[PDB]
Amino acid sequence: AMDDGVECAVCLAELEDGEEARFLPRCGHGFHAECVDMWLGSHSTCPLCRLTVVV
Numbered sequence: 295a296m297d298d299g300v301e302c303a304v305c306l307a308e309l310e311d312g313e314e315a316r317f318l319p320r321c322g323h324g325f326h327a328e329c330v331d332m333w334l335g336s337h338s339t340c341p342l343c344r345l346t347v348v349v
């Protein structure tokens with residue numbers, strides 16, 4: 295398949311319809327609403343690059 299798109303740096307699951315992926319403004323890296331939340335647990339920023347979302 296086309297393994298060249300938005301990969302979840304947390305669960306690494308092809309972002310498909312039915313989930314709530316959250317993309318950030320600094321970069322746009324799209325992650326899951328669930329993985330992006332468990333990935334926070336302290337880091338309030340993007341999990342792949344680390345571009346905080348709050349200004």
Ligand SMILES: [Zn+2]
Pocket residue numbers: 302304305306307325326329330
């Ligand atoms: Zn995920």
Ligand SMILES: [Zn+2]
Pocket residue numbers: 318321322323340341342343344345
């Ligand atoms: Zn990012």
